[PDB]
Amino acid sequence: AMSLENVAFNVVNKGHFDGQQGEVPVSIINNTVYTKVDGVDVELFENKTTLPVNVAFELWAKRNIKPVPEVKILNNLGVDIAANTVIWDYKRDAPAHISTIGVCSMTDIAKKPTETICAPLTVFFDGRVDGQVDLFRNARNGVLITEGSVKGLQPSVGPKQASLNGVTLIGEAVKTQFNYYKKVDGVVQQLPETYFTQSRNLQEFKPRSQMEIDFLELAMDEFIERYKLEGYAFEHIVYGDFSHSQLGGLHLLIGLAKRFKESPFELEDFIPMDSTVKNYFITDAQTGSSKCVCSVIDLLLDDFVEIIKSQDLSVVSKVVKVTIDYTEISFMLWCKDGHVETFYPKLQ
Amino acid sequence: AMSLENVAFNVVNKGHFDGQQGEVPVSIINNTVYTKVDGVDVELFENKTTLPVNVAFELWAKRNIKPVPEVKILNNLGVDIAANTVIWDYKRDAPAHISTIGVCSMTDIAKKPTETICAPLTVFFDGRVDGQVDLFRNARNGVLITEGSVKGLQPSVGPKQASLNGVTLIGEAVKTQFNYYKKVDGVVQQLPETYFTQSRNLQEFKPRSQMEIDFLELAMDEFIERYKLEGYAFEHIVYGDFSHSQLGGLHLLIGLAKRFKESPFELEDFIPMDSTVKNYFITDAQTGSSKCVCSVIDLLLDDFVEIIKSQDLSVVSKVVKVTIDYTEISFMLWCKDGHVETFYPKLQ
Amino acid sequence: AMSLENVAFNVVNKGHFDGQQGEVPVSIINNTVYTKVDGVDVELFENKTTLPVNVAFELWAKRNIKPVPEVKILNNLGVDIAANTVIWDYKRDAPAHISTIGVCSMTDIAKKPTETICAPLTVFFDGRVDGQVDLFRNARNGVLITEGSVKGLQPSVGPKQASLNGVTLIGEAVKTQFNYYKKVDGVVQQLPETYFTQSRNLQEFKPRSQMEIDFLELAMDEFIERYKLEGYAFEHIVYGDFSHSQLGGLHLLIGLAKRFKESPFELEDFIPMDSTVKNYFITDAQTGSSKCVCSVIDLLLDDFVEIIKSQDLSVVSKVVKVTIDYTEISFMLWCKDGHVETFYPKLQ
Amino acid sequence: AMSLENVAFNVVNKGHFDGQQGEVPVSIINNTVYTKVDGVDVELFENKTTLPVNVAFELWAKRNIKPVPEVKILNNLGVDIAANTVIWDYKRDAPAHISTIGVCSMTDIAKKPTETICAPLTVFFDGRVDGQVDLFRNARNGVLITEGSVKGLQPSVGPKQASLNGVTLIGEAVKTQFNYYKKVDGVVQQLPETYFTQSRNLQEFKPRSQMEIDFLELAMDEFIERYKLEGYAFEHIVYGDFSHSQLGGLHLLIGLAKRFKESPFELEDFIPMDSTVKNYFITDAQTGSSKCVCSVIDLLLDDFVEIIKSQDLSVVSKVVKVTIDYTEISFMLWCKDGHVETFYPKLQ
Amino acid sequence: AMSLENVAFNVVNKGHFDGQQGEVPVSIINNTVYTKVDGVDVELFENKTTLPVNVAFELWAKRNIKPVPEVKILNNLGVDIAANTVIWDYKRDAPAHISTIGVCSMTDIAKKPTETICAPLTVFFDGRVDGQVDLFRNARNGVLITEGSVKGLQPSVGPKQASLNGVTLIGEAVKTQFNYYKKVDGVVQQLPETYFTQSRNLQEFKPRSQMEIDFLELAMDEFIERYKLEGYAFEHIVYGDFSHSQLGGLHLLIGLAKRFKESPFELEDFIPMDSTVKNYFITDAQTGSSKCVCSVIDLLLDDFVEIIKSQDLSVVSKVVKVTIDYTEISFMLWCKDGHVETFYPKLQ
Ligand SMILES: CC(C)Sc1ccccc1NC(N)=O
Numbered sequence A, B, C, D, E: 001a002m003s004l005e006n007v008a009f010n011v012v013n014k015g016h017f018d019g020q021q022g023e024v025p026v027s028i029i030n031n032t033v034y035t036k037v038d039g040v041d042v043e044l045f046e047n048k049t050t051l052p053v054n055v056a057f058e059l060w061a062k063r064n065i066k067p068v069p070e071v072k073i074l075n076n077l078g079v080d081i082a083a084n085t086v087i088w089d090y091k092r093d094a095p096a097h098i099s100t101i102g103v104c105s106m107t108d109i110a111k112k113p114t115e116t117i118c119a120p121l122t123v124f125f126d127g128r129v130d131g132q133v134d135l136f137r138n139a140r141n142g143v144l145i146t147e148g149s150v151k152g153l154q155p156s157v158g159p160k161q162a163s164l165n166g167v168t169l170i171g172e173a174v175k176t177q178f179n180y181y182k183k184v185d186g187v188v189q190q191l192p193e194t195y196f197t198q199s200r201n202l203q204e205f206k207p208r209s210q211m212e213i214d215f216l217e218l219a220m221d222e223f224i225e226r227y228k229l230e231g232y233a234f235e236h237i238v239y240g241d242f243s244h245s246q247l248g249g250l251h252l253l254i255g256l257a258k259r260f261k262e263s264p265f266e267l268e269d270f271i272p273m274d275s276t277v278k279n280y281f282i283t284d285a286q287t288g289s290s291k292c293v294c295s296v297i298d299l300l301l302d303d304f305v306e307i308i309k310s311q312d313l314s315v316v317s318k319v320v321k322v323t324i325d326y327t328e329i330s331f332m333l334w335c336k337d338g339h340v341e342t343f344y345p346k347l348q
């Protein structure tokens, strides 16, 4: 007996949808859900989605409150829908997927992922929920996460971090590192060997290795000397070149974080969605150096050093394909006389 | 267990709120309520009120579907709220009253009209509903309607017509003529002697007397001769004067109806609400004669003839107060040499 | 090179989308599309759909402007989507189907109905469009309409009428009677023997048989005598009983049309969508007789007489299933002592 | 002569409504009020209320710009409306009360609080405004604040802090500590002995005692040793337990502030309104420990220590009622073998 | 071939409008532009302007991405429109000017500034764009910026800083100091000798002189002693007086910045637009000292000291006119016995 008033009751009393019985009076005005408290209207939800306000309110109330894979991972793995849950995209303030399975009558395409409509779609399955490993086994298409071993299924160790209520974290009180599994056309697909993005913020950037501590602490030339990085264009790629009107390089998050300590800058997120490679319209405030499309990736500096040092530097220009977050990221490698000139996540 | 989904279920299955159990999926987009049927969205309600869309939808679903007094009568009698019903104002496409009693949790000021918040308000009571005549006995302020006699109470015979789902009609299969009772501060009132407006439409105007049949059939001068109306300015007041840029007179609905048969005209209802006297910005299409504020009353021609023939015609200008629909309507009477020049419902 | 400006250009110059090149300046304000003409904004489209304004504008511009099956037929035949066209639902002011095939980039699930996403869906195909009869041969699920014969396929003669730009008509200058074909899981179906609804309006109702001319012209008792209809409750079912507070019967459109000539009434279309059986909240203006859910079907009086005369009248109450517009309509038949009491399209 | 243009003139010239004469041109588009400056539209107000945009704009312009009691205090004291002022709720971006008295024609229920409509409502009176102490004396229901002694009226010393234009502060240049008085049904009610919440922010939390300085500075075990708090479950209640998936305790703001210095966390304010006890959906970012409904109170640590040390610890579970901000806050006290297990503001 | 889909394509691929060919699918819902990515809608633009959503989206995409004069300078110079560009007002999130020239078909008044409609308007010309110096020479009214000498044209050295994508900065990698030129009625107007505002933020305020370093570092009395400022009311004007209910002075940004280090305060920007003098409704959080209209100017402390020391202090009150950002700012100078009492940017 699902209702707007019951969803609102659950939100008010339980902080989210928790299957409790009860109703609270609700006002819907424009794209906002209100509830009367002390005689006045109090905002419960503001619809930032393209779904109707009451539908979006229900999916947001029914969001997964356990640590879940970051939306960029689900996207990279081709996830279309989730089995009996809502993966909430906190970066977009909207559901990560168009439709639902057993969640809300307005968005539901099926009540159970066993229905034939779900066969062609890659359904997300959560091994932490009873019966979902078996539903993945029977699903034609799907992505499954588990906390442990599934008999006969070859696992892929996922990233250390997961999203818990919009907070990307490496769990200490909860497990955030999952085993990943994927099926395409009934066949269990082998997940490729991959690097993982670190999912760090520029404002609260923390180094996660001795090389990362040395990059942030040391001067440019003594870090490049210490790590034998001469001829790898780190001055351009990682540190950034702010001497000309067009900002040079600056494709690693750690480089933006080092710069951020000294001087601020504006990063325009013109396609605001979680992705392995992010594109920003950057304006350096100290110099006025800017670039409309500056691709940024948050790789551990050690991982980036390993990628660039594993490349053949004998050709003027070429595409270098690197598996990151299960997706193939194309990089553009430009060389001259055996040295790197630039290396950046290719603007497709 | 009131809900948006249950209200929508009732509307879809029962044509209105009927206390049935069940839920249908609903979409709220801007000011419109939709329901999914055959995979697509079907409009259930468009909010034309100042209330939130879901609140207005519920009060409209919970509207009184029995013949009820016309909103102009309830307003004239000082009705503030209704006991356990919604009087729907079909002319405003909104509830006739701000608040409710035992109808909707968002608009309710009380569950029963016996609550102290209702004592200062004139509560509308319906004798056709069990217990409401006795609820009117214990009510400090209120208006009661009945079909028959109430022991100890002297009735006031109301108008022949009532509103049934927005259709004003004189009932043949249902009773539409109610007895009216009013209480002010615990005291049963003596409702005044009153005329009633006929509530007719211009498009479907029907005469309700031999004088009204003679007005519509006969030529102007032979009707005025037949009914001894010489010197009462009917040529101006009732027939209308379309010879000058400013339209002269035309204050009785029957006169507009006679004109409407020959030539059309535009009536701009600039304050669209039910009222004893209506104000229109009229433009005669045949002549181009117009008037910004043309007060129109629908009185039975016999009643209007009685009112104008009962006036002293010896003063240039004066206010003539007439009880119509239980309210005091001020008229402006203009005379010259013992004859009427004009007589119109005063524009204040 | 599809664009908002190009769609608007086509609408302004061609009256609809016609694949012409060009752009006109457009304003989008709330749910309305405007274009500048003579320096001022002129309304091109008002979005009455649950789709975004520009998406709905494009599907409405791309609507099928040929006589097409009425949405109720497509719905009854299980049509999910149309192949490379938009069937516009003029009763809902919205697209008849959720998604499109080769029409609009925002709503498209495929460019051609041969794509695997379309195999589980019943795709509507139009033989009048080149290649669509052969696309229906290779389609797993679909409904085909043709004007003439298809080799190897046994036709189902559809209704005489079709919808041309929202006008339901029996074509004289165009063909409106199509042959219908349906395929379910690669298998050509044998469409059932069916009656068709006549799709007439109450305001412009025209008789389509000598019995229908006699019903509208003759008095109740002499029509019932002429056609030997005594004991079939036509007085109740077809003519209507307006003597009690609850309106009795009145389930055939011809009966509402006969009543409409004498007195008007209000029909509240509370679920406004095309369907074989329509449900109205009716209020008779002459008597005040009313009914919340009055099911109305527009059957040819001869067809209705044949259905009721082909029933066993020996049981108090039972469900009578009749194929109308290819769907199974349940009727409720109430009898007493071998005569009909009522017979109405069952309210479920 | 109140007007939209006059309100806008006052806002533009005086920073708020100041009774000045004049008009500025205004644009209303959707829920925003604009004014033309340098040829372009400049935003004056964005309506975040459920009132119409122009009505909300006027009440916001007419807001009380003097230090006023925090909305949680007014709510706890049962305040329904204010006498000739608008108490603006800066946390909700809306008026603290539904209706007004002598402020705005659209929201006014009366021009003066002496009108009979105000008798049943608890009217807020401000002794700093001439004649309001006398209006409280004559009011059937009311809450009065004063800066000093009122002859014969027994005062209640309120909190040290008040809200000045949305800034909660302890006044140095203005008085923020008021004497409070309350009347119910004509009778001056004795205000209970109460604790007060400190109204601090987590980001700018400042200790207000030597115990509070010692809690923030000292290690958990040496603070518990210094203040003889062994067996009072401060490790759970105040410090918080982040070792399990469900976050343990953490019900005092000072505890959240101590944690905030080391690691960040997300506090979801699912009912965003000022209240003595706040409920948050917390997610600790360092550990991933979370709780859907974590009740938090900002009590001075000395006051909380006094409350918990004044309880009988001989029963497994019981409700402990404590007057805080004039309201009775129920706490749940759980004990085992004479020691505290948990003590939290009860989730009603 | 301008289109919504092409603008969106440019934004998605190039970070702004860059004249590239291509189309991306777009959704318009309410005042937001979305694009489908990974099956879901991603927000491209939220309309905060009074223009239609698609029109505002196009002007924002077509915004000038080079360092441009701050909107306050353009306003002070009487700029009405820009030649073939959009000056984006990042403080208002809207175009700085009502109309465009050669930018967007919906807002364009002309394709080239040579059209007679542009003759009466002051058109902004950018010498960095080919042919714009010549268009200024031929324009009846205009403001021109250049990076160097224009033969025969007497230059005005503008401010050191310019706005680059909403970031006010003094360019190191780009030129931000322009030569300014103005024409009124065909005649090149001499720009006056002017002071410039520093355009600093309170949160990130940096001193730009030894006097400014000494003001922020030194105690009030020793700074006033060091710079011989006794009798110039700096204690009131620059430091601020927070001892009374009405906040005294505080008209220089550096003074607000010094206060901000010790205690926070609320600055209500009631007319949110870039201007030489800003008006704030300030509330000091430490003391509760407040002022509805506190005029604040960001002048270099040396420049302010020079202005106040160049005034005759022998009259009680007078208007002191100072050219700042090319506009004449009126100041109110109040003196007593040869000393300053107050000096503030006059509240007009
Ligand atoms: C008490 C009866 C003899 S009179 C009565 C009957 C029905 C309704 C009302 C009233 N009178 C009243 N004052 O409430």
Ligand SMILES: CC(C)Sc1ccccc1NC(N)=O
Residues within 6 Å of the ligand: C133, C134, C136, C137, C138, C139, C150, C151, C152, C153, C183, C186, C187, C188
């Ligand atoms: C193959 C033909 C003899 S039969 C045919 C002709 C036209 C449309 C459809 C079908 N049959 C089908 N199963 O698709």
